[PDB]
Paper text:
PPARγ distributes in adipose tissue, regulating adipocyte differentiation, lipid storage, inflammation, hypertension, and atherosclerosis. Different from RXRα with the L-shaped ligand-binding pocket, PPARγ uses a much larger Y-shaped pocket for ligand-binding. And PPARγ ligand-binding pocket can be divided into two sub-pockets, AF-2 sub-pocket and β-sheet sub-pocket. PPARγ agonists are categorized as full and partial agonists, depending on their activities in the cell-based reporter assays. It is suggested that PPARγ partial agonists bind only β-sheet sub-pocket, while full agonists always occupy both AF-2 and β-sheet sub-pockets to activate PPARγ. However, our co-crystal structure of PPARγLBD-magnolol reveals a distinct ligand binding mode. While, in PPARγLBD-magnolol structure, the hydroxyl groups from the two bound ligands interact with Ser342 in β-sheet, Tyr473 in AF-2 motif, and Ser289 in helix 3 of PPARγ, respectively. Although magnolol is big enough to accommodate mostly the L-shaped RXRα ligand-binding pocket, two magnolol molecules have to cooperatively occupy the much larger Y-shaped PPARγ ligand-binding pocket. The value of approximately 2 indicates that magnolol binding is positively cooperative, and both the binding sites can bind magnolol simultaneously. Thus two magnolol molecules cooperatively induce PPARγ activation by interacting with both AF-2 motif and β-sheet, respectively. Considering the large differences between RXRα L-shaped pocket and PPARγ Y-shaped pocket, future dual agonist design may focus on PPARγ sub-pockets, since each PPARγ sub-pocket has a similar size to the whole pocket of RXRα.
Nuclear receptors are ligand-regulated transcription factors, involving multiple signalling pathways, among which RXRα and PPARγ are in the central positions. Once activated by their agonists, RXRα and PPARγ translocate into the nucleus forming RXRα:RXRα homodimer or RXRα:PPARγ heterodimer, which subsequently binds to RXRE or PPRE to initial their target genes transcription, respectively. Interestingly, we find that magnolol is a dual agonist of both RXRα and PPARγ. To reveal the molecular basis for magnolol function, we determine the crystal structures of both RXRαLBD-magnolol and PPARγLBD-magnolol.
Numbering used by the authors: 207 to 241, 244 to 264, 274 to 459, 464 to 477
Write the structure that this text describes.
Amino acid sequence: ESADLRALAKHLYDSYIKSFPLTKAKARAILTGKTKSPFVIYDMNSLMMGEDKIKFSKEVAIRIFQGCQFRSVEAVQEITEYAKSIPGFVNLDLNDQVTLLKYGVHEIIYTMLASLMNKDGVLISEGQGFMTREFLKSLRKPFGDFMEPKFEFAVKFNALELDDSDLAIFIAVIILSGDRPGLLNVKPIEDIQDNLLQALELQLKLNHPESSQLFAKLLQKMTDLRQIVTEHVQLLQVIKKTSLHPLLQEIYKDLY
Ligand SMILES: C=CCc1ccc(O)c(-c2cc(CC=C)ccc2O)c1
Ligand SMILES: C=CCc1ccc(O)c(-c2cc(CC=C)ccc2O)c1
């Protein structure tokens, strides 16, 4: 029983390493200076210098919004390739595969975003850049309101000190939520998640002797993430009153 759960964990970790360009391990090493330093964007001048220097003519707030929008669409492709590696996922009905992805990707994006963040800012362009929390806040309304709730989540989430092995299972649990609207076959999804949760619980016990509360804390974080997405899509709704990506538009119309 436990041997199969450890096999699941390893399979997910190996797939995780394949699917995502920058792991938390590599991100924290860059953030602590335990490695070539990223270009720091902290004001308008450094933003322009960063755009020329970093290998990635409109209004600054819009330019940053567009780049982040396009990074989000790349993120969903990465998550989709990871999802297909989760044992049993591809055996699900295709309509349920896409439904789980649509309702789940943004929760996963903000989960993994936390790996790139500290209290001072966020790693961008696969660790080549570092954009400060206060610079993002200084952007004109309502663009300055986007990242702050993510930073707020990240500092609390990062205090849990999860590693890539923990996160691989955590994100798999989130993708396979049987309570997403419009699901055709709930039972096979619940079966997979129950096994992933067992694997998660075992992983946390072995990997984190310093805390017996982690599993419960992580369940709490899963509900918190749903609130972050809801806040994000509502802030996206008021921007309809100020070039939105069509793929994201399709995801949002289900989320509204
Ligand atoms: C790794 C994915 C990239 C990612 C992650 C979280 C995010 O909140 C955003 C994001 C940021 C802004 C703020 C810029 C003005 C606007 C829209 C967004 O979608 C992008
Ligand atoms: C001017 C910079 C706008 C810009 C352009 C391309 C990018 O990929 C990103 C980027 C954004 C986040 C989310 C944090 C805000 C994470 C990773 C990234 O790489 C940002």
